[PDB]
Amino acid sequence: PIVIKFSHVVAEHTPKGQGALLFKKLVEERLPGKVKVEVYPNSSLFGDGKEMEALLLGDVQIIAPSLAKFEQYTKKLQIFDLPFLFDNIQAVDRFQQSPQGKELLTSMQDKGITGLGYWHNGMKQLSANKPLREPKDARGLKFRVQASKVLEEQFKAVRANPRKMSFAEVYQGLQTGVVNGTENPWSNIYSQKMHEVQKYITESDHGVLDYMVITNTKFWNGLPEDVRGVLAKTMDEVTVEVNKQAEALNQGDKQRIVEAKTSEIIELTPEQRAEWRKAMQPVWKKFEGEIGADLIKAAEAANQ
Ligand SMILES: [Zn+2]
Ligand SMILES: [Zn+2]
Ligand SMILES: [Zn+2]
Ligand SMILES: [Zn+2]
Numbered sequence: 001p002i003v004i005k006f007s008h009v010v011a012e013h014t015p016k017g018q019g020a021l022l023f024k025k026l027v028e029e030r031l032p033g034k035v036k037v038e039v040y041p042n043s044s045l046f047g048d049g050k051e052m053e054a055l056l057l058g059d060v061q062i063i064a065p066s067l068a069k070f071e072q073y074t075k076k077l078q079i080f081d082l083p084f085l086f087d088n089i090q091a092v093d094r095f096q097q098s099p100q101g102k103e104l105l106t107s108m109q110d111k112g113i114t115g116l117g118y119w120h121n122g123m124k125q126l127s128a129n130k131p132l133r134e135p136k137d138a139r140g141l142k143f144r145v146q147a148s149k150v151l152e153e154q155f156k157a158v159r160a161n162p163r164k165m166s167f168a169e170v171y172q173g174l175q176t177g178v179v180n181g182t183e184n185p186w187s188n189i190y191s192q193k194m195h196e197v198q199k200y201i202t203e204s205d206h207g208v209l210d211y212m213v214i215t216n217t218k219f220w221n222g223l224p225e226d227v228r229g230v231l232a233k234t235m236d237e238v239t240v241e242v243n244k245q246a247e248a249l250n251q252g253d254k255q256r257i258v259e260a261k262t263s264e265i266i267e268l269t270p271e272q273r274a275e276w277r278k279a280m281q282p283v284w285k286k287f288e289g290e291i292g293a294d295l296i297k298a299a300e301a302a303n304q
Contacts, residue, residue: 002035002227004061007045007054009167011191015121015249016064016211017041019242023062026234035227048166049147055216056112064119064211068148074107075290079299081150082287083207083280087303089120089247092208095302100295105212114220116213116232117239121185122250123205127198128181131266135279144170144182151183153283154207158276167192174198185209190253195263202266206276213239 004027006020024037040046046054048069054060067080079085086092095101096118105115126132128141138158145151147164155162163179167188173179174197182194183206189195213235220228257263268276288296 001031001033002223004035004037004231005040005045005059006037006062006064007040007051007060008064009043009048009051010041010188012041013249014187014191015242015246016119018245018249019119019238020064022241023235023238026237027231030230030234031227035231043166043168047168055214058216058219061219062116062213062215064213066146067118067208067210067212068146068151070108070212071147071149073111073113076104076107076292076295077212078148078150078287079291079295080208080210081148081154082284082296082299083154084277085284085296085299086208089123091302092210093118093120093243095299096210098298098302100298108214109217112217114215114217116215116235118243119211119213119239120243120246121187121209121211122246124183124185124207124209125189126181126183126202126204126206127189127194127200127263129197129199131200131264132181132202132204133266133268133272134275138181141181142179144173144179150283150287151207153286154280157280157283170194171197183207186250186253186257190256190260195257195260199263200266201257201263202268204268204273204276206280 006023008016008020010016020039024039027035027037046060051060051063051065055063067077070077130137132138135158138160140159142161142163143155144165145155145162152162165173170182171192171194174182174194184194189201195201258265284296
């Protein structure tokens with residue numbers, strides 16, 4: 001049978017972990033003995049920085065990186081890293097589903113990459129070992145970020161020192177003080193045990209953590225036409241399921257963090273969140289040229 005390896009960096013009980021397993025389940029039911037899907041979670045096959053290489057060499061067939069990890073391949077997806085760009089999940093989704101959003105699935109056509117869909121995880125929450133209530137609280141702290149120039153600028157704006165690190169390394173980075181804070185949707189905090197090394201988590205909802213499911217074009221377009229049709233439809237069905245349950249999964253993990261009795265969750269007043277927005281939101285200007293001013297204008301159109 002055709003072997004499709006699906007490699008990723010997250011735990012199994014997460015939006016993407018559940019999505020990859022559902023794709024396996026449905027594909028193997030629908031194309032019995034014709035296609036096998038092998039899922040490799042937790043960087044067990046390929047980790048951050050090295051999965052793109054694997055995809056293009058043909059060592060893996062599907063990956064689903066954070067939208068924040070494509071700056072070396074396209075400058076357009078950086079739009080999803082802009083702090084406080086999207087007001088809510090619906091806006092992010094409306095942008096992703098718009099004609100412009102869909103065209104971004106082909107933004108790496110020249111690198112032999114096909115975009116299969118957007119998978120929603122959730123908005124990011126700040127964490128540290130000190131209460132982060134207002135921007136000045138972040139001053140002098142070292143924050144782990146995904147490998148994104150936008151996210152680096154986000155923290156530089158609040159006089160913090162960002163450090164790019166691969167996802168598998170964050171827990172150890174926090175425990176050893178290499179970094180003392182970070183940002184993550186709830187499910188990535190709980191599943192990587194980061195609450196055990198982060199005393200305070202602020203419900204800031206200050207940016208998006210979503211994925212683009214991608215494949216190798218040469219591989220995908222080389223599949224039998226009948227097989228690809230079923231795979232594409234199945235992936236679309238998985239995308240719907242992932243997206244409908246991501247918020248609920250993250251809420252479950254928020255509650256699991258509360259029940260773990262390791263951390264305190266800080267809620268922000270509208271005014272407090274407004275302070276963070278004023279401090280960080282201006283970073284957009286530094287990337288307008290690369291992203292496209294009109295693209296950013298379309299993103300704002302999604303907020304309504
Ligand atoms: Zn807004
Ligand atoms: Zn999202
Ligand atoms: Zn969500
Ligand atoms: Zn063919």
